Amino acid sequence: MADQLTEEQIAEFKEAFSLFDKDGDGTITTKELGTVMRSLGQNPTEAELQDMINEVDADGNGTIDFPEFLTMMARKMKDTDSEEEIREAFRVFDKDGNGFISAAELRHVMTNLGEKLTDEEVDEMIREADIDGDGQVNYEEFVTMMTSK
């Protein structure tokens, strides 16, 4: 199961698991995924989380421990993994759906995700991410700024 992975990737995957498993009991609960969705500004609630916690579990119980999390993400990384997560991140960043992340959506994300940035800091981040000088972050610039730093 976990033999396909190595300690180098497990070092980051344990942090990824603990991102949801905040209470420290060793297994992700429904409230733990709900608070992550709320922190990311996502809508889904019990009606979806109850089915999710069992469908992406591959075990048959209403919680997700570290081996179960590792199993599904291992099935993911064995297949093609790179594009879809980036597209989903760009979609959730791009609230308006116009394909260009403006200052307002980025500010809404940062204040919802946990920061309290001022207007000047958001403008500086936009102007640093805006490679082509358009004034809005497109898909290529978003990918570059996410994979950089």
Partner: protein, 587 residues
């Protein structure tokens, strides 16, 4: 959903982790020391003036020959002291597509002043980030004025808090090389303590003839091209060879070799080599091969992945150095890494030799449209590179705006003052209404200063700080309503941005003792060192007969530390001296 939501959330959180790791460290580089030093300045003066009695003794202690051109010269007056308005005027003049030729006399004046100023500089310019807490490094431009304008718009104009480093190759392969060179010289003259210029391989008369820069000069100035080229020759001769960042990072254009030594380079006379490929040999003596080889290697070398050092066959000049050569160079010179520029990269930057070598390129579309992107490096106090990529356009160059930006150091001292002055805001307003019974919001400078001094006894030169604590104030009365708004709303205090009030804060604390601290900071480590203090004492006691006694130096060195950690920050030293002088002048 399933995979999509979880993977997006974890990826966003991973980006967030790095963002926070950068941001908290950036703010911690200032705030935790600034709060302690402000507490020292406000309270420790009481302990300081007790020992002030014993320490009174030493602690306070040729010509114009140009000709008129044709009907294409525009009027743009330039005077010997270069200021900001000259910079904006030159930027506006060069930005025009038609009618962008300034008078030859101003070009000659700028070139002569640049050569005269560069003559006094040493071979290697030392750069320290004690005050700025940041530094910017730019790569090759090759006459791309659009790239320079984009960089200036993105990162702001050069200033004491925003130093700029250029790694050569300002000319050749560009339609506006002369404008780029003139703008760089003007910025260097306007900000001598914030602009550092390094000589490149393309800064050569032979290189100019090879790439047609002299033809561009002749086309721009058909009458005075010879004189302009002669003046440019002196600037090329007097360009510095390189710079060192905090005695840890070396910035060179080409690179180094196995026999390259910085000790020999620091002794090379730059005046002799007007041209590198074809030395003039004006002195009438045979060329020194050993001395010329160092310059040739540091100007024309390029890195290679293969081990060992071999001559650069592809370029025909310089040598290829592998990771072992880089490791030996770093060990011998006790350096961390090296920033260089010379070879073009698709992303404008590239890491080589397990990140011991960093290559930066700033000219976008070097070979064709979309061939490569331009980039520049932003480095913090801990010298971690940060790369920002950009692509220049001819249409958007007219919509750009330039500002000097807001300093990092000033962003903490004002904020902490505003935060800690909130405890007496009600009493301040009450005393203002006592001096202004009609609550009109305007009282005289003396009345206002006396009021807030009585409310909060600090003794600071409040008249100079009036420009910071009361925007829009008049020469007769001070608007204390905005001063109260600063305590009630931090937005008003933060909205100052760029302004002329910076010199008022620079007068306090930041005297020439700022440069004195850098002089006494031999190892360039933060908040000085006790070993540096004793080493300085050991030669300051007997360097000249007017020197003070060793016991006097020991007491003052122990006094320069305010928080008691055994080390003295630059701002801590400035605050200690400021408090000593203030008590001396007030007693």
């Amino acid at each position: 959903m399933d995979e999509n939501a979880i993977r997006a959330a974890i990826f966003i959180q991973k980006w967030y982790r790095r963002h926070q790791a950068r941001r908290e460290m950036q703010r911690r580089c200032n705030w935790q020391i600034f709060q302690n030093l402000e507490y020292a300045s406000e309270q420790d003066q009481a302990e300081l003036y007790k020992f002030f009695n014993d320490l009174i003794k030493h602690m306070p202690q040729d010509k114009d020959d140009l000709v008129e051109e044709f009907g294409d010269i525009v009027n743009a007056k330039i005077e010997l002291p270069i200021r900001k308005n000259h910079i904006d005027l030159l930027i506006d003049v060069f930005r025009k597509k038609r009618g962008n030729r300034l008078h030859p006399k101003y070009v000659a004046l700028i070139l002569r002043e640049a050569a005269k100023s560069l003559k006094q500089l040493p071979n290697i310019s030392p750069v320290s980030t004690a005050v700025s807490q940041q530094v910017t490094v730019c790569g090759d431009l090759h006459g791309k004025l659009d790239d320079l304008l984009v960089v200036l718009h993105k990162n702001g104009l050069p200033s004491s808090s925003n130093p700029y480093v250029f790694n050569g190759d300002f000319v050749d392969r560009g339609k506006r090389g002369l404008e780029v060179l003139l703008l760089l010289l003007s910025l260097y003259l306007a900000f001598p303590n914030a602009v550092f210029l390094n000589r490149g391989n393309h800064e050569d008369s032979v290189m100019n003839a090879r790439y047609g820069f002299i033809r561009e000069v002749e086309s721009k100035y058909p009458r005075n091209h010879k004189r302009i080229l002669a003046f440019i020759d002196e600037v090329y001769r007097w360009l510095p060879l390189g710079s060192v960042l905090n005695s840890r990072v070396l910035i060179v254009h080409g690179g180094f070799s196995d026999s390259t030594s910085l000790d020999l380079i620091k002794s090379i006379d730059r005046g002799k080599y007007v041209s590198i490929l074809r030395p003039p040999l004006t002195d009438g003596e045979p060329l020194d091969k050993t001395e010329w080889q160092q310059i040739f290697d540091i100007m024309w070398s390029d890195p290679q992945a293969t081990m060992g050092c071999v001559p650069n066959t592809l370029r025909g000049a310089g040598v290829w150095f592998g990771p072992d050569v880089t490791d030996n160079f770093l060990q011998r010179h006790r350096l961390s890494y090296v920033i260089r520029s010379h070879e073009c990269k698709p992303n404008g930057h590239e890491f080589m030799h397990d990140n011991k070598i960093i290559t930066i390129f700033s000219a976008s579309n070097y070979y064709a449209i979309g061939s490569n992107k331009g980039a520049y490096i932003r480095l913090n106090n801990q010298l971690m590179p940060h790369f920002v990529q950009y692509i220049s356009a001819a249409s958007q160059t007219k919509r750009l705006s330039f500002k000097q930006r807001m300093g990092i150091v000033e962003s903490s001292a004002l904020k902490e003052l505003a935060v800690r002055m909130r405890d007496h805001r009600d009493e301040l307003e009450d005393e203002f209404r006592k001096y202004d019974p009609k609550d009109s919001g305007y009282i005289s400078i003396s009345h206002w200063c006396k009021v807030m001094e009585n409310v909060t006894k600090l003794g600071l030169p409040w008249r100079l700080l009036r420009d910071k604590l009361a925007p829009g104030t008049d020469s007769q009365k001070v608007n204390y309503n905005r001063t109260l708004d600063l305590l009630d709303t931090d937005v008003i205090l933060e909205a100052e941005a760029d302004g002329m009030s910076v010199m008022d804060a620079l007068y306090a604390n930041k005297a020439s003792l700022v440069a004195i601290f850098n002089i006494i900071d031999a190892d360039n480590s933060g908040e000085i060192t006790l070993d540096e203090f004793e080493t300085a004492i050991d030669l300051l006691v007997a360097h000249m007969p007017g020197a003070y006694s060793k016991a006097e130096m020991l007491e003052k060195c122990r006094m320069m530390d305010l928080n008691g950690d055994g080390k003295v920050d630059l701002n801590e030293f400035l605050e200690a001296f400021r408090l000593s002088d203030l008590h001396r002048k007030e007693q």
